[PDB]
From a paper:
Here, we report the structure and function of the O. tauri photosystem I (PSI) supercomplex in low light conditions, where it expands its photon-absorbing capacity by assembling with the light-harvesting complexes I (LHCI) and a prasinophyte-specific light-harvesting complex (Lhcp). Interestingly, nine Lhcp subunits, including one Lhcp1 monomer with a phosphorylated amino-terminal threonine and eight Lhcp2 monomers, oligomerize into three trimers and associate with PSI on the third side between Lhca6 and PsaK. While Lhcp, Lhcb (apoproteins of LHCII), and Lhca (apoproteins of LHCI) all belong to the LHC superfamily, Lhcp proteins form a separate clade with characteristics of an ancestral state of LHC proteins instead of belonging to the clades of Lhcb or Lhca. In terms of pigment composition, OtLhcp1 and OtLhcp2 each contain 14 Chl molecules (8 Chl a, 5 Chl b, and 1 Mdp) and 7 carotenoid molecules (4 Dlt, 2 Prx, and 1 Nex).
Residue numbers in the entry:
A (entry chain T), C (entry chain U): 33 to 233
B (entry chain S): 32 to 233
């Protein structure tokens, strides 16, 4: 069987708990899943390569002294911008991000006409043609690849929700919590931290 | 639509992408919730401009034991609210009058209690159009357009009240105080710098 | 004029605030209510009998030590544990609890075939084929008595939600809070607690 975990994909079946009234939700959760996938991975990798929590990473790059993020990346012996130049600038990064992500979102969602000329209908979260340089979808199964991605989508969104509530409970960070739970499983869990009071009680 | 350009839409204008419109009672609830929110956000706006007390702390000034503090709080007042010598707006006094007046108005708004007026005023209609609009602004103005204006103000003010309650929970400083801090230096005074400070808990 | 209150029962009428959802919700609210009945009664009785909150009561039986719960039951002729060996140890109780409850839930919902084969159908709101040994309510106005328990379900669920929320607010316990209210409501209240700050502000 395909998708036998719990419930069924939006493409086929009905939610056990929700009515699934609106068909905008399907692609919404695809996009949300993909973003979460990149977010969870980011939180996984940053705290490994740098040791900082993902939720306090924002404090390193601020409109004054954004140079803290420079050279934080593993390997990458050259910093983001040279030391002493002070060019890692929150506003410069923010403007570059605003223009790039805003243009990408406008192209995806039809706020602006697509720059390309080859199909790419607005609102489809599986474009394929331009977004498969390797040609893995035509070689593989399209439907089961889409199901795998969905499983990853929902798994990563649930992992992100876990990351934020772990951040709120323990105030430490995802990987450090994972390592504490691995080291002493009985003595590092949610009920253990509840016995400590979650840091406020 | 042409008239409603906001992200969402008005009930009857169409259907919302998220949580589409169900029962009409939901639309009545939205309008009334808006109306009370407009009143609430305006009160939280004007009171601490007049005297500086955040709305989430203004409750405790009046207490069953002592309620003198609420008297003479309104700026510009010619005299005390009740005798200067012995202010008599006691919390119980306030309650006993207000529960009766508000309960009456509510039951008479919804018609669970027989209407006093019986002027053709039909309960369960957000726009009574009777004595409530003596100016009859709706009669001169265009009623569809004006309904859209009312709902836009409803949603804006309900969102503003949500902002007021969450700002109270994060910064516990006060709405206009948060405004003045942000206008003072928005770059270094906003939600994310308060997050860096930790919202007062972390 | 049965159920002449704010709302209506799932069988007749429609939900005033929330969309009625599905039949799955209609069967599920009752089960949540039965569990909330048991939970609220357990919190009430454990606190009257022991004096320590239901929430903190989870720290009494830890993997390292479960002997604290040995002599907590009021009016017990002897402690359940021998007091001297600490035989519970949280592991026997955990394992037998998970097997018994998991089996019971599996048989309730037909995850596994029912063993009685007494004609009972899985997923029924009120099976009653062997869940009414006394028969006092089976014979005579069954529909009304379902309304009775329905009203108790919604109450116990609301009471549990209030229990968890004011546990969060005050961190003292439900009936400690109830005694504080009853002794002098006017100076010991939710709004008084908010003005002083529940545990914060
Ligand atoms: C939507 C994407 C995104 C999300 C979810 C976050 C989320 C966060 N950022 Mg980041 N950021 C994001 C994008 C960006 N941030 C920054 C720059 C910063 C700074 C400068 C700071 C944060 C901070 C924070 C944290 C607290 C602020 C908040 O709103 O939580 C409120 C809490 C909720 C639960 C939301 C409901 C939180 C983990 C702050 C921080 O680290 O505080 C500890 C901080 O000071 N972020 C930039 C500019 C490059 C971004 C660009 O898109
Ligand atoms: C040959 C150069 C070089 C080498 C050996 C490594 C080596 C490594 N990098 Mg680095 N990196 C290098 C260049 C760069 N890295 C990064 C950005 C990153 C990221 C974003 C990540 C790594 C990660 C890793 C690890 C896999 C490993 C420690 C990954 C890791 O696991 O971090 C611990 C990871 O996620 N590197 C950039 C962009 C500025 C580079 C540019 O030159
Ligand atoms: C000579 C009389 C008189 C004068 C000049 C003022 C003048 C003022 N009052 Mg006061 N009031 C007066 C009598 C009274 N006021 C109030 C109750 C209020 C309220 C409820 C409000 C004011 C507000 C204001 C301010 C309007 C600023 C803007 O607009 C201003 C300081 C407003 C304010 O705070 O704006 C800053 C406001 O919201 N006054 C009452 C009823 C108790 C009064 C009775 O006579
Ligand atoms: C629409 C009605 C209404 C609303 C929304 C509020 C809202 C509030 N009052 Mg006010 N009040 C209201 C009517 C009245 N109050 C008072 C008199 C008081 C007093 C005496 C006190 C409050 C307090 C509070 C706060 C309670 C916060 C809380 O419980 O934790 C948060 C709850 C949530 C987030 C809900 C979920 C909040 C700002 C208390 C306070 O904050 O004191 C500083 C307090 O002590 N109010 C009277 C009678 C004269 C009212 C009459 O209708
Ligand atoms: C109590 C207030 C309230 C009520 C009853 C409604 C009701 C309605 N709105 Mg309105 N709306 C509101 C507030 C409200 N809205 C606010 C504040 C905004 C601005 C963000 C809007 C923006 C809006 C748009 C843009 C649209 C609607 C639409 C609708 C209809 C869709 C069905 C629905 O969502 O109902 C259920 C009612 C809800 C309020 C949804 C629940 C929201 C959840 C619970 C999140 C809220 C979190 C909460 C504030 C947490 C507080 C915690 C705090 C106390 C600590 C219905 C008539 C749609 C419509 O009519 O389309 C034809 C539509 O397009 N509304
Ligand atoms: C576990 C929580 C839970 C669950 C699953 C439900 C589920 C349901 N309730 Mg119940 N209810 C609950 C909590 C819950 N309620 C509590 C705590 C209260 C007390 C405030 C109520 C009071 C209540 C009323 C008053 C009504 C419902 C109704 C309903 C239906 C509405 C659909 C829905 O929300 O799903 C469904 C059977 C409605 C219904 O069955 O429609 C006729 C209805 O009229 N419920
Ligand atoms: C005081 C609360 C109360 C009341 C008066 C009833 C009353 C009734 N229930 Mg409900 N019920 C309750 C609590 C309550 N129940 C709780 C806590 C549980 C869980 C242990 C149940 C589990 C339950 C089941 C599983 C069944 C009933 C049945 C019945 C009937 C016997 C009668 C209508 C039976 C029935 O109606 O059979 C037709 C039936 O099948 N109820
Ligand atoms: C039927 C359920 C139920 C019952 C019997 C009680 C009973 C009680 N509560 Mg609890 N409570 C409930 C639901 C309930 N509450 C819910 C749903 C909430 C969350 C909104 C709370 C939050 C709450 C707090 C924070 C506090 C109490 C307190 C109290 C006691 C005094 C009443 C009071 O000041 O607050 C009554 C407030 C409510 C009933 C909330 C009503 C909100 C809905 C939306 C209306 C009393 C024992 C207080 C206490 O003992 O300390 C002095 C206290 O500090 N309760
Ligand atoms: C990497 C990085 C580094 C920096 O340090 C900081 C930083 C913040 C920038 C960060 C960047 C992160 C990013 C870009 C994140 C993007 C995240 C996103 C899009 C998250 C979405 C999260 C979604 C959630 C929770 C869903 C909850 C919904 C639930 C359970 C309902 C489930 C439900 C339904 C639907 C149907 C069933 O039948 C029944 C049930 C009830 C189960
Ligand atoms: C004035 C005063 C002074 C004293 O000092 C103190 C004091 C406390 C007494 C105080 C008194 C104030 C009072 C009485 C206030 C009354 C306030 C009221 C009625 C608030 C209502 C607040 C309503 C909210 C948040 C709604 C949230 C809903 C949201 C986002 C969903 C939005 C949604 C929908 C629906 C469908 C779309 O498709 C899209 C999306 C998903 C966005």
């Amino acid at each position: 069987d395909i998708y036998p975990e719990f419930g069924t994909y939006p493409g086929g079946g009905e939610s056990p708990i929700i009515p699934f009234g609106s068909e905008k939700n399907a692609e919404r959760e695809v996009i949300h899943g993909r973003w979460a996938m990149l977010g969870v991975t980011g939180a996984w990798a940053a705290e490994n390569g740098t040791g900082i929590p993902w939720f306090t990473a924002g404090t390193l790059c601020t409109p004054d002294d954004c140079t803290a993020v420079a050279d934080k990346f593993p390997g990458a012996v050259a910093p983001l911008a040279p030391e002493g130049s002070g060019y890692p600038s929150f506003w410069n990064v923010l403007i570059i991000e605003i223009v790039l992500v805003g243009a990408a979102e406008a192209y995806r969602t039809g706020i602006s006409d697509s720059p390309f000329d080859d199909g790419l209908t607005v609102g489809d979260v599986n474009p394929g043609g331009r977004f498969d340089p390797l040609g893995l979808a035509e070689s593989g199964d399209l439907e089961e690849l889409k199901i795998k991605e969905l499983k990853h989508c929902r798994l990563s969104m649930f992992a992100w929700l876990g990351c934020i509530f772990q951040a709120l409970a323990t105030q430490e960070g995802p990987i450090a919590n994972w390592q504490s739970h691995v080291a002493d499983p009985v003595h590092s869990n949610v009920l253990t931290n509840a016995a400590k009071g979650f840091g406020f009680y």
